[PDB]
Structures are given as structure tokens and as C-alpha cells.
Write a protein that binds this DNA or RNA. Sequence first.
DNA 1: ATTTTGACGCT
Length: 425
Amino acid sequence: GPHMATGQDRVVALVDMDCFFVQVEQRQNPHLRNKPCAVVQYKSWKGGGIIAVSYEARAFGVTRSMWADDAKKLCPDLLLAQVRESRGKANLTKYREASVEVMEIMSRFAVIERASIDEAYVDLTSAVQERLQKLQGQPISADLLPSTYIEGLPQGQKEGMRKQGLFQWLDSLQIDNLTSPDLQLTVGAVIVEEMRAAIERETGFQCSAGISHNKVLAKLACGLNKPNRQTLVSHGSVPQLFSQMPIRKIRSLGGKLGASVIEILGIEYMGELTQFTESQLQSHFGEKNGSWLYAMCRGIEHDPVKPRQLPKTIGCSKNFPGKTALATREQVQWWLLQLAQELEERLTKDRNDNDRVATQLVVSIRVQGDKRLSSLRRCCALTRYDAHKMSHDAFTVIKNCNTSGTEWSPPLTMLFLCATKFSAS
DNA sequence: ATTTTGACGCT
Ligand SMILES: Nc1nc2c(ncn2[C@H]2C[C@H](O)[C@@H](COP(=O)(O)NP(=O)(O)OP(=O)(O)O)O2)c(=O)[nH]1
Ligand SMILES: [Mg+2]
Ligand SMILES: [Mg+2]
């Protein structure tokens, strides 16, 4: 009743760039704009592995994790942009810099949590309050929401349906009550329209966004109407939306835990979770997951928007599959040095930009025939931004995996260096 | 022989 808090305190947005790496290449190369295109890594093996796909190319069935030659079977006019290669490995600098452009714009509006190279959460609660105070009871015009969908509306062509649903929502709005959750979301969506306009104006990149009361709902909402649209998911829309939402569609439930929720409880959709008690869910999935599931299937989640715009770790990774696996000492040293050189470059620039220094070097490896993605992860001190020292320490720290009596055995199918434990400088 | 990352939980 009155004391059942409903998780309507906050206004949170998730902004995510549409086919991000492809848009970065399309800005740089106009010939790629408004075409089926994809971004790949490498080119010798099956034309390279696809990691980003324009929506034109998606209409042919091209997806991420597809080989480019297979994709070309689906889309013979597919255009391909290749990730930069440096020191014999993929170099993602162009996209990290494009990302920093986007993040710095979003930061002007509110405090953001960088959730990936192409997406950030925004806590808009304060900003919505300020804007409601500025409006002074003025109602919200549909002109202020040109790309906004209201999930679950209309009830009772695409743009036509969007405008119908928006009209229904705006007519139902109690603009006088500065404290109504639904009004707060609506004003949040006005600000998110402004944010996405600024992002497009100042970068050329288009994006989508979700507006709701928490991070999970904002993220789920963002995907409902991609590309180049934003979606308002209200508290009241949760029962219908969740009544047919596969559990795996909710962030963090797409893997083993989601599968066990399905198998143990004997359910399919998010909504069905509501029929279990908190204690029941805690019994099956632990106290934390259980509490979180009990509130999440009612649309409630409390995870804060962390004020963090920059990555907490800086890492360099390369796989060496099958017959390219590193089998000699010279090879492991040369590739550890290549990794350490790219890492050093990134870390020096990080220090100059962000006034901080990493203090811990993590070295991770895979050995051939190991089932696990990571076979060993060991850490050492990172005291100098010197690639030669970093590669020597990584070797010093992993060399006791070589069972050879000049050789390396088992051959290494992955090297991974990661700087962590940052400290102000 | 999708690859290259990065956050975060568990013990
Ligand atoms: N190297 C690498 N980069 C990746 C991988 N997966 C994604 N990226 C890169 C490429 C992606 O562009 C970017 C952000 O990933 P999304 O937001 O999940 N997909 P996108 O923005 O392309 O399309 P939309 O969001 O409109 O559905 O991260 C990967 O496995 N490896
Ligand atoms: Mg994206
Ligand atoms: Mg994303």
C-alpha cells in the first residue's frame, strides 16, 4: 500500500550509439554512409570477424560475430571497414577517441557512468527538477519529443503510431504535480532529446536512448526502438512489457543465471517472477540475486548511476588460435613486447589526459587446449610506463608455465596485459 | 579459427 516504495525516485537514462564503430568509419569515409556496411577485425581468416553492422546490412541478416565472407554470402554489396592494425594486432584507438567525444558531450548535461565504449547511463533526477522549476507549470508539447516512443502506447505507419502513443501519453499527463513520476520521466525524455541532438550536432553520430527510473529499465528501453529513437518506459508499463519479455533480455540475465532462473522456476518471461516470494528467490539464487530479482520483476532496481566517465582498467589482448599459437620463447617475448608497447602508449596518454597512474600490471594467458578463456592471471607491480620493463615483468611472472626442458609448451593461445589500480597523479 | 576488451561478483 502506502509504504510499498515503488522505485520511482530517480530518472535514469541509458544512451547507446547506433552501430557505433560503423558510424565512426562512415563519418571518416562518406562513401560508406547509408549503405550496408560492417566493421571487421583482420582480413586473412574468412575476410575477418564482424564486430559492428549498419542497419542497412542488418536487413540482410548480417550480424556481429559473423565472418565477413559468410556475411558477403548474405549481402554481396556489403561494404567493410577494417580495424586499424599496429604492432601486428588490432588497435581500437579511433573508437576510444570517438567514444571520448560522445562521453564529454553527455557530461555537460549530467553526471554519467561510462558503461561501455559506446554507452553511458545518466542520472537526470536533479536536471529534471531544475527543468520542471523552469517550466513553471507549462505543459509539455509533442514538438519537444520528436523521436520519443512511449512503450505500451497507443492502446485502445510507424511515425503515425509513435505520434499516436505520444499524444495519448501527453494528454494523460498531470503537469501540475511536480512530483508525479510520469511527469518526471517525460521531462527526462525532453532532456534526452536535447542530449541526442547535441551528440549528433557535435559528432555526426546518431544514438538511441532509454528513459526510465533505473539502469536496467533504461537499458532495456533503449533497445526497443533502435536506431535513432529513444524510448520512455514508465513504471506503469512494466507489467505488460514484462508479461512477454524473455528473461534473457534483461541485463545480467542473458547467461547462466538467466538459464537457471528459467529451468529451476519453470518460467519463460520476466513477469512470472512476481509470483515467488523474496525468500524463495533468495533460496534458489542467493540473497543478493534473490533480492535483486524480486524487485526487478516489479520494475524496481536501486543500483546507482556511478559517477565514472573513464575506464577503470586499460588492457591489451591478442588471441593466437590453433596453428598460430606461440610455441617458442622468442615469440612470447616479441608479442609481450608488442602488447606492452601499445599499453605504454595508451597509459602515457591516459596519465597526461586524466591525471592518474596505474599501479598494478595484470598478465593473463591461455594455453592451447585449455577449456577456459583465461588459463592464468597473475599480477605484479607497475612502477614505470616502460614497455620493455612491463613485458619483462609479464614474462618473469608467467615463465613458470613453460614445461619444456628455448621452446614453449603448451603453446599460448592468448596473451593479455591489463593496467589496473589507478591512483591520482 | 568470431576477437578485443572491460565491469563486476565470489571466495
Ligand atoms: N573488439 C570488439 N569490439 C566489440 C565487440 N562487440 C562490440 N564491440 C564494439 C563494436 C560496437 O559498435 C561497439 C558498441 O557495441 P554495441 O552497442 O553492443 N553495438 P553497436 O553500437 O555496433 O550497434 P547497436 O548498439 O546500434 O545495436 O563495441 C567485440 O566482441 N569485440
Ligand atoms: Mg551501440
Ligand atoms: Mg552498446
